């Protein structure tokens, strides 16, 4: 799966993972791309907030899915 995380600015990032992988696998890899620390990292996908331990599945997250780091 191709996901696209949008930063706070609307920066694209385009990550590669699989469906089993966690919301917290997820935040390593925006931290690699973009150097955002995991614990100031907020994530939502479809209104949704995304919890670190669930999986992109357990979130019906798709290919060519959005998620939005968001604050607060
Ligand atoms: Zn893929
Ligand atoms: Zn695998
Ligand atoms: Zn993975
Ligand atoms: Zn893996």
Do not use: C, W
Request: hydrophobic fraction near 35%; avoid cysteine; proline fraction near 4%.
């Amino acid at each position: 799966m191709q996901i696209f995380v949008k930063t706070l600015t609307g920066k694209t990032i385009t990550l590669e993972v699989e469906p089993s992988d966690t919301i917290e696998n997820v935040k390593a890899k925006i931290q690699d791309k973009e150097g955002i620390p995991p614990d100031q990292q907020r994530l939502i996908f479809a209104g949704k907030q995304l919890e670190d331990g669930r999986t992109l599945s357990d979130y019906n997250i798709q290919k060519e899915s959005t998620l939005h780091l968001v604050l607060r």
